[PDB]
Design a binder for this molecule. Sequence first.
Ligand SMILES: Nc1nc2c(ncn2[C@@H]2O[C@H](COP(=O)(O)OP(=O)(O)O)[C@@H](O)[C@H]2O)c(=O)[nH]1
Ligand SMILES: [Mg+2]
Lengths: 372, 57, 339
Amino acid sequence: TEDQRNEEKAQREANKKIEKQLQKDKQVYRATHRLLLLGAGESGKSTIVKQMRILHVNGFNGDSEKATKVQDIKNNLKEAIETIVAAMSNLVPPVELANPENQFRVDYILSVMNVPDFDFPPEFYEHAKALWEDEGVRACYERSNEYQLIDCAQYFLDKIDVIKQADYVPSDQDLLRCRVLTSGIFETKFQVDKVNFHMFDVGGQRDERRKWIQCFNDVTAIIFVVASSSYNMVIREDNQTNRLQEALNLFKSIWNNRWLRTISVILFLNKQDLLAEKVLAGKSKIEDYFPEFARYTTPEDATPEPGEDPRVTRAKYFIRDEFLRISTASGDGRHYCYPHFTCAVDTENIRRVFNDCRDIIQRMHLRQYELL
Amino acid sequence: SIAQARKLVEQLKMEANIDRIKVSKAAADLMAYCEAHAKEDPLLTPVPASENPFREK
Amino acid sequence: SELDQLRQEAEQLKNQIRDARKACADATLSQITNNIDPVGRIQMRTRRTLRGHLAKIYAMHWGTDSRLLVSASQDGKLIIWDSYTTNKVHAIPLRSSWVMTCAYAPSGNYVACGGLDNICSIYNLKTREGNVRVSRELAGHTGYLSCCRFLDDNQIVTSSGDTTCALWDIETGQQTTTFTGHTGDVMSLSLAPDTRLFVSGACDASAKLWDVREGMCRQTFTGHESDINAICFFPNGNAFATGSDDATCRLFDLRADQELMTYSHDNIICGITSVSFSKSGRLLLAGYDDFNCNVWDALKADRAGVLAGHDNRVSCLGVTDDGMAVATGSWDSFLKIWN
Ligand SMILES: Nc1nc2c(ncn2[C@@H]2O[C@H](COP(=O)(O)OP(=O)(O)O)[C@@H](O)[C@H]2O)c(=O)[nH]1
Ligand SMILES: [Mg+2]
C-alpha cells in the first residue's frame, strides 16, 4: 500500500504549491493601501469612489450597464420633480403655483408617484419641464431645506430635454451627480505611480451600533466625508436631527472607537461648491443653526483660495474646526486627523486633493508595518 | 408601528403558555449527564499518548 | 388608545413570565453542584500551530471527521487544514475579502462563508474539473452575514445583521423558512443535536429558541447586559451557553426556561468572542479579547484553566465531535490546536 505513502507525499506538494502561492499573495497584500470611507448618508462617499474609477480604472460598460445608468438618472429626475411639487402644500406657509392653469400638470405628477413600473412617457418630461419653469415651483425648491430633496435635483431638472431623448448617452458628470443607494460593499482597486490602492465603501442605511466596525481595525487610513453644506438640513430617519450635528456625533464615535485607536483619519470637508453657494445667498445663515458661529474668529493660518469671499473663508473653517475640536480632545498621538476641503463632483479637485494625501498615506502604511 | 405591537402581544402569549419544569430537576439532569459521559470525554479524562492523534510520532 | 393599550398588556405578559420563571426556581445550579468534586488543574498544550493566513482570522469550523477544519481570514482566503499533518488541502480565494463566518458541511462535500457582502457563498469541495471555486451564492439578506451552519448538503441556516435568520434551499436559492424576532444584529447561531431547533444570539442582549420547521420563536432568554457575540448548545440539547461583551458567560436550560448560572470574574472586563462545550459538557471553553481562552467548569462556575498562546484577539474556537482537541483562531493570523 505505498500509495498510502504516495498520498502523504501528494499531500505535501499540494501544500508546497499553496505556500508558494501564498507568498506571492503576501506581497500583493503588503503593498496594498486599504482605505475605508465613512460618513453620514448623502455625504459623498460613493461619489469619491466614482472619481477613483474615472481617474484610474477601465472597467466594463456593456448594454446592461448603460441601461442601468440611464434608468437610475431617470429615477433621480422623477423623484426630484415629484418631491418638490408634493411638498408645496405641506410647507408652512404653503406655496402656490404662479400660473394656476398648470394645475393639471401638478395633478398628473402626483398621480404617477409610487407606481411600480413607470414607462417614462413623453408627457412626463413635458409636464416636469413646464412645472420646473414655474416661478412658484422654484420658490418651493429654494425652501428644500424644509423637506428631503436629493442634491442633484436642479442639475437633472435643467437638462430634461437631454435626458428624455432616445439616444441619450449620460456623461460622466451625470454619473457623478446620480444618487444611488449603495448596498453591501462598493470597492475599487487602482495603481498610481506603482503604488496600488484599495478603496471600499460600506453600503446600507443608518446603523447606530456599528458592529461591523471591527473589520477595519487594520486599514491604512479612514477617509471621513462631511456634507458641510448640510448645516441647515435634517437627516432622513427622524426628520429632526441636524445633518451636520449627526456628522459630528458619528465622527466622535469613529474617532473614539476602541478598534480604531491607531487608525488615522483623512477628513474630506465635501460640498464646498454648495457651501459657498449657500453662504453667499444669505437666506440660511449658519448662526441660526449653530449659534457659536457668531462668536467665531477666522484663523490667521487660514489659506483662502484666489477670489474667495471672506464670508466663505470663515464659514468653511468653522465647520473644519468643529471636527478638529473632537480629534484633539483625545488620541495620545496614536493617530491623527488631516482635514481637506473637497468637491466630490469636481474631478480635477479630487485628483489634486488625492495627490496631496499620497505621502501621508504612504508612511501611515509604513508605520503599521513598523518600518518607520 | 401598530402592527408590531400586536405581534409582540401574541408572541408573549405563546411564551407564557409554556410548561416549565423546576430547576432542581433540570440542574439534576444536566449534572447527571456530565458524570455519565465524563469517562468518555478526552479533555476531562486525558487518554494516553498512544491514543491522542496530536501526540503520536 | 389601542396602541398604548397593547403596550401595557405587553408589560403584563412580561411580568407574568417573570413570576412563572421564579415559581419553578426552587433551587440554584450552584447549590446542587456545590458538593461535586472539582475537575482539578486542566492544562492543555499547543500541539499544532497552523501558519497559512496573511491577516486576521475571523472564523473556523471543524469537519465531521474531527481531522479537517476550514478557517476564514480577511486576506481574501479560505484555507482548509489537515490538523494531523499541518498540511493545507485548499486555499480558496474569495470575491469579497471581508469574511466573518465559515461553515463546513457535515458530509464534507461543501464549505460556506460570508461577511459584509450580505451573501452566503457555497464552495463545492468536489468539483469535477477545476479548482475549488464558488458554486452558489445565497443572496437576500439586507445585512452582514454573521454566522451560518449546514443542516444537509441542500440546506443551511444563516444569521445576519438585519436582525433576521433564514433557512435556505441551496439549489433553488429560496428561503424555506425565515426567523424574525430580534431587535439587534444576530451575531451567532447554534444548531441543536437533533437539528429540530436552534438558538441565536443577537445585539439585543437576548437569545431565542427557534422552531426550524415553522419559524416560531418558542422561547426567549434574557439576563445579559450587552450584545451577545457567541452561542453554543449543551451536548444533550436541553441547554446552551452564551458569550457577551459584558465579560460574562451564562447557561440557560430550555425546559426550565431561565438562566441557570453565570461565569465571570471581577478580574475580567473584556467581552467574549466564542464559546464551546466539551464532549461531556462538563467544560465550557470561551475566547476573549484579552488574547486568551478560559476553560470554565460548567457545573461549579469556577475557572479550571487558561489557553494562553495567542498574541491578539481570540476570535473563534471549537471542539471536535470526538472531543479530542480544541482549535482556536485569533487576529494574530494563527490557528493553534489544543488538548
Ligand atoms: N454639488 C455637489 N454634490 C455632491 C458633492 N458630493 C456629493 N454630491 C452629491 O451627493 C449625492 C449622494 O452622494 P453619495 O456618494 O451617495 O454619498 P453617500 O450616501 O455617503 O454614499 C450625489 O448624487 C452627488 O451628486 C459635491 O461636492 N458637490
Ligand atoms: Mg452610498
